[PDB]
Amino acid sequence: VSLKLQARLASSILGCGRARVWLDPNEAVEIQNANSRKSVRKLIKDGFIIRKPVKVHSRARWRKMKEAKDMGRHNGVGRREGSREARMPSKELWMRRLRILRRLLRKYRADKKIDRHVYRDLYVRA
Amino acid sequence: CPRVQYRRRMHYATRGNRMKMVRTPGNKLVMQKRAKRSQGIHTPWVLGHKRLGGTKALRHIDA
Amino acid sequence: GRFKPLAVKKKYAKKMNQNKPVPYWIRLRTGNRIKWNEKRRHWRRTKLNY
Amino acid sequence: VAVRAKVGSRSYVRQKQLAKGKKVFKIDCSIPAADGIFSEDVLGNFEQFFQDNTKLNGRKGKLSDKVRLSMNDNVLTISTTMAYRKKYFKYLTKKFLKKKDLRDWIRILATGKGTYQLKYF
Amino acid sequence: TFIVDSRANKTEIKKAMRKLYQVKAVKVNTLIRPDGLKKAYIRLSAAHDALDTANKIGL
Amino acid sequence: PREIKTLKEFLAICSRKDARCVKVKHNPSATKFKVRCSRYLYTLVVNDKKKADKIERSIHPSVKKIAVTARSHAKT
RNA sequence: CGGGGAAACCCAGGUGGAGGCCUGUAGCGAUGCUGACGUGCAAAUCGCUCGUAUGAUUUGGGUAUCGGAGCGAAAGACUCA
RNA sequence: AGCAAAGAUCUAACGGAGAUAUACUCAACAUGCAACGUUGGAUACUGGAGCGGGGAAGGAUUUCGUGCCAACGGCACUCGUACACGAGUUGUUCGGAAACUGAGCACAACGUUAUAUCGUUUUGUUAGGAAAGUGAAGGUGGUCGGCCAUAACUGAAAAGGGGCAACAGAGAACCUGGGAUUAUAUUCCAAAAAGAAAUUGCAUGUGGG
RNA sequence: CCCAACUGCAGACCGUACUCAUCACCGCAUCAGGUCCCCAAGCAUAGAAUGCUCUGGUACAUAGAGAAAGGUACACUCAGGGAAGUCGGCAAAAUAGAUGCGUAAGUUCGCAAGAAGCAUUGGCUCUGAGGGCAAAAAUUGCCAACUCAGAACUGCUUACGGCGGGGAAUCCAACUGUAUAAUUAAAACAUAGGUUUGUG
RNA sequence: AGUGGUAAUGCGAAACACUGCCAGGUAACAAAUCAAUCCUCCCACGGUGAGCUUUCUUUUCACCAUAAUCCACCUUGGGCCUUUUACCGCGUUGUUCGGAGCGGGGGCUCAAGAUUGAAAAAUGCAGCUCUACGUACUGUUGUGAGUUCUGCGCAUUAACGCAAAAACCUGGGGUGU
Ligand SMILES: NC[C@@H]1O[C@H](O[C@H]2[C@@H](O)[C@H](O[C@@H]3[C@@H](O)[C@H](N)C[C@H](N)[C@H]3O[C@H]3O[C@H](CO)[C@@H](O)[C@H](O)[C@H]3N)O[C@@H]2CO)[C@H](N)[C@@H](O)[C@@H]1O
């Protein structure tokens, strides 16, 4: 009757969890005389105990939602819930811009398009 | 998403403990310990406590 | 927990070896007095606190 | 990601043709055919089902010179130069195999690096 | 496996497993039980069979 | 564990008294001669399959040779 | 960086991230319902609402100060109901 | 009176004494109700500040298997952290100690007190206060190629006695795999150690001065 | 005698099971109270808020049948009126996110300030901007990750959760803070600032 | 009785051997900003198995692992050396730097990684195929988001300035002479 010892040893041999082990409801006779980890490993090998697959958690409903949001479909004013400077921080927008400007000025000065007098004038104005 | 335990009888996040969170050949995260580091060999405090060159930061038995 | 002194472990080990019932042949001696043990300690009812 | 998508451009997508060519996917139908169940009335639709429902550049049923089938002895052999997945024709077999209630009798099963095999349970 | 006295170390258990029993202990793993007794696991040197010793003791 | 560079240093390690066993591992590309000495495990990586068998024949007489296989769970 | 001015200096756009600053979790408190309970879940708790939440902030272990004495941002409060 | 917070259970097959339990002339409903465990299935919940997985303090066998239902688990029980019986905690490296100092403590010494059960005792540091028992260099005479090293006299130099107090500070040489448990494991695994190392003490041999 | 790389041998003591809590500790008890530390997934969203979900766990806290009155609720609505109720707007209602505009008296010029008060917000199909590294390189190739603005077209029953009601004055204390564990959180206490006294 | 390089400083099988006395360093502590490691999450590639299919879905879900310890040595942040001397220039998201030596050209180093290898496939996992806890085979991207490890201090607000010691390390001086 009590298959509780063979259900505990099966969760620790299969390494999964008790809502995920499947003990065969017909062979409650062949299972209940296991008493060892060696015997439960024979019952797992015989198909009397298995791991069931995990329950589904699908991202297909998010992935289709992301393809709308990549074309900008659900981002308007009513759908915006947090502040402007939390969705896009204005320090991040300044840091990203100023690094683009300084990387370009090092690129044109190393390519010798501009002079070091032109660089230093355009560096502090950037 | 895997959650891990301390493994070495001490369970407090001090600067001596500082665990390292690594994946094993048996495909599990364990929790290994980071060694404390040395500041390195220095110039005297009264001369400007500066790091010497050509000398390595070696702690206690690696020194 | 894990830390105990060995002199506390050996006092906790004596009380495990005292927590056993009276055997049945004690109840069959001549001038018998003892039916039950009167000192059966349970870990939840009464605390040793060593 | 560089340029925005359009909803109207979901008709035609990019299949990313191979550089070298000839990625070939055999499907061995020898057990359900010779041992009864699949006659030469369904096996002539099995070679038809892939020509009719394999998608190529997003569109269904319009493969021309990029997918070729040609039906060997008991093997349906999909020769292509477009980047398909081997896991796609296991999928596209199970739709045909569900449509004729044969997905309680037949397992499609991987045997080699570029072939399947319909077998019984 | 033996109950030993609780005030012996692992070195003097190996030397008693040589004078009593003519075998060689390579590894002793002692354990003071919740009963209060010290239990030792005593691995022999693979030149000595464990059952051949345990028949001579008798168990 | 360490690693042997040449063959003149491999034969000095197999001449040592601590070298219990040389384990021979046939990779699909190379072979590995894993000498198990008393502190380190020395490995000679011979990439050529024809020169590998010539090196096995020079450690014939009194060192233990072991063909490394996949021991199953049932040997335990 | 720009602009105005003879000068003294003013005016603007950014940058920056200061505070016993603010809204608000956890934490720490306990305003109102004079709510529930009031032989209770509880010899003081439950519920919602509320005070604060980078600081005179919260907290563990260890230590040190007591009976006409201790300690007290002070209520004769607290010192194992 | 009550056993009303923390949503919630349903189903079939087995198990079990716990049933499908009937004096006639009765087909069944209207004369055995309720309730238990396990596995399967369905339905939910917790929702990673968890009715998750490990530790301290505290507990000290509640752990585990097997039996078992008198009393206890405010209903129930075939279940149990109950009861009886049998087991179970494996370390050169993990935590502590050996072996650190901190806030502090107060042994010796000194003072006090009718009375030590009292005081001082880290601001560099005891005590009116001779608390170093260690030994540079050399002399004396068995050893290794004027250097060593090993044994016994003389004497430079070191002011400031001991011991505690931190399982979260300091310090600390081991990591995976395991078919290795009913229960322990960075602790068990023995010749292919599943194995790969790191470290301490002492010793041979080879080689070098 | 010194030293290297190696080798040979040995590596002692104690702890280690289980728990750490809506049952294992403390409150007389398997008590809705308290109780230090570490690990910490997905989607919505500013998000350790809040709502739901894969992993892990759970279905255990006496249940069944069931329209009284009366209650209690981390439950709702209510026509017309709109504080007339009441010691007292107590309790509920109301306000609400985000973006654009706008904002008074007073002021220690720092604020008041989210003052007040207005407007916009969906879904869909597009268009603009905001970049990288690889070879008048002021231009040809290839490519990720997102954000904002604009535009037609179309719909609204104004429709999860979460989230300030606002204004005019008077009293008192400057402020944040502390504070009668278990009826008083205050205007009390503290505070910076001010003064005094004793002291070489 | 150590020895290379103008120099930053280099070279370790066993003499570059030892330490009455002395002096340093390590232990040894520090915000926020930005950049962020292990790792997590996502996306992208695919392979294996599973789930769905009246219709649709080149589809949804799971998995895809690499421990210490060595060995050999491409980046991007510190310090510096040598050469040219420059007083406008270099640089950061950011409050600044330079004849008391900026910037270039060559270097020397340190710190954090990357990479090749020994370990290590012999292991791990999921599949599957054959006549008993049996066997033979088959598979093992990212200028995305979060991460205090690190950069990192004579290092924070400050009338706040942030423990100690054991143990160890190097030098000075001496011995070897
Ligand atoms: N040494 C270089 C000099 O720079 C000068 O350039 C300066 C001027 O052109 C100009 O100076 C302006 C000017 O517009 C006007 N006439 C006066 C004004 N005060 C100045 O403004 C300047 O100073 C104010 C401070 O008051 C700053 O806010 C600001 O950075 C700067 N624009 O801005 C420049 C300073 O940044 C001139 N080219 C010349 O005098 C010379 O080359």
Ligand SMILES: [Mg+2]
């Ligand atoms: Mg506030």
Ligand SMILES: [Mg+2]
């Ligand atoms: Mg009073």
Ligand SMILES: [Mg+2]
């Ligand atoms: Mg009831």
Ligand SMILES: [Mg+2]
């Ligand atoms: Mg839920």
Ligand SMILES: [Mg+2]
């Ligand atoms: Mg009962």
Ligand SMILES: [Mg+2]
């Ligand atoms: Mg009992």
Ligand SMILES: [Mg+2]
């Ligand atoms: Mg409780």
Ligand SMILES: [Mg+2]
């Ligand atoms: Mg009105």
Ligand SMILES: [Mg+2]
């Ligand atoms: Mg920092």
